[PDB]
A paper describes a structure:
To construct a bright, near-infrared chemigenetic Ca2+ sensor for use in animals, we focused on the [name]-[name] ligand. This dye-ligand has emission just on the edge of the near-infrared and has previously been reported to efficiently label neurons in mouse brains following intravascular injection. Unfortunately, the optimal range of KL–Z for bioavailability shows little overlap with the optimal range for environmental sensitivity. Thus, the excellent bioavailability of the [name]-[name] ligand is at the expense of environmental sensitivity; this dye-ligand does not exhibit large Ca2+-dependent fluorescence changes when used with the previously published HaloCaMP sensors. Instead of tuning the lactone–zwitterion equilibrium to find a dye with suboptimal bioavailability and environmental sensitivity, we hypothesized that we could generate Ca2+-binding-induced fluorescence changes via reversible quenching of the dye by tryptophan from the protein through PET. Mutating G171 on [name] to a tryptophan decreased fluorescence emission of bound [name] by 85%, providing a way to strongly modulate the dye fluorescence emission. We next sought to couple the fluorescence quenching of [name]-bound [name] to Ca2+-induced conformational changes in the protein. We explored different topologies of peptide calmodulin (CaM) insertions into HaloTagG171W at positions spatially proximal to the bound dye and screened for insertions that retained a high dye-ligand-capture rate close to that of [name] (above 106 M−1 s−1)17 to ensure good labeling with dye-ligand following bolus loading into complex tissue. Insertion of the myosin light-chain kinase (MLCK) CaM-binding peptide followed by CaM at position R179 of HaloTag7G171W resulted in a protein with a fast dye-ligand-capture rate and a modest Ca2+-dependent change in fluorescence.
Numbering used by the authors: 4 to 296
Amino acid sequence: IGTGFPFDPHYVEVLGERMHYVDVGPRDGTPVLFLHGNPTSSYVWRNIIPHVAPTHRCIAPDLIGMGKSDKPDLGYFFDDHVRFMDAFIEALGLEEVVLVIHDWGSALGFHWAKRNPERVKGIAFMEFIRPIPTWDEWPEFARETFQAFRTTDVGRKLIIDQNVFIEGTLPMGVVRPLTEVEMDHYREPFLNPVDREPLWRFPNELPIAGEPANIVALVEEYMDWLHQSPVPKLLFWGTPGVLIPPAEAARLAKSLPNCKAVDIGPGLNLLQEDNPDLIGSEIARWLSTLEIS
Ligand SMILES: *CCCCCCOCCOCCNC(=O)c1c(F)c(F)c(C(=O)O)c(C2=C3C=CC(=[N+]4CCC4)C=C3[Si](C)(C)c3cc(N4CCC4)ccc32)c1F
Ligand SMILES: [Cl-]
């Protein structure tokens, strides 16, 4: 499993800030937009993009405040991410896209798709944000930690002061061990504690047990949209999962129209780090099937 990030930096001005993105593959055709979540960057896509790049343009931005993107003094609310990702997409002049989305990148992608349904030709998604009706529907092993994250004094001490999301939670969302080189790539954007705001706001935005109400509403609205939409869908899932346990993937594979589900074997949250060759190969082959009517 490759540790290298062999992609030239691309930058675009977005709302008076600069965002970093990977941009590889042919210039023409429908682009494939890859959206990472918490607490990763375009680095999470590094071993999946090589399967897609031969046939499609691959675009993998770093969310505002993350990766090699700028770090303005925001609260990094989901609303901030929405504002910046909307402006990113318009800044590149993207018309129709295929979405490949994960964790908070999936909340961005589904929310955008809902608002721009004629521009989304396909969605591949994994370990995505859905409402977690109660804390019992959150994995027991992660329950105490995410409950602690979702306070101001304790949460901010763990995530901002001690960097527990990067040093602890991240490696514990992968079944295989992350190497030191991989950890250093994930650490790089957050070496300065003041830049860790996004790592703390994100778990505080998770729609868990009806809170926060604004995120719960927005997430229910896109999961309704997704159940009504004929858009081609590709769902990767792992055992035991974190956001998406196997029973939920089984349910969505049937409830979502035009949905193919693929089992990656053992995984938790960062499925990309446990089976990148399967995810990359299935995306590439599924993209080809979008052109078979
Ligand atoms: C969008 C949704 C994203 C989900 C991504 C994450 O998926 C859920 C995974 O949740 C894991 C929750 N658990 C922890 O974060 C955690 C602990 F609760 C915990 F008690 C400990 C611990 O100290 O034992 C660790 C942990 C840490 C914690 C802190 C830390 N540092 C601060 C400076 C260094 C380092 C670690 Si490490 C990588 C040495 C570690 C290793 C293990 N194992 C089991 C075999 C090696 C276990 C825990 C920790 C937590 F990460
Ligand atoms: Cl999170």
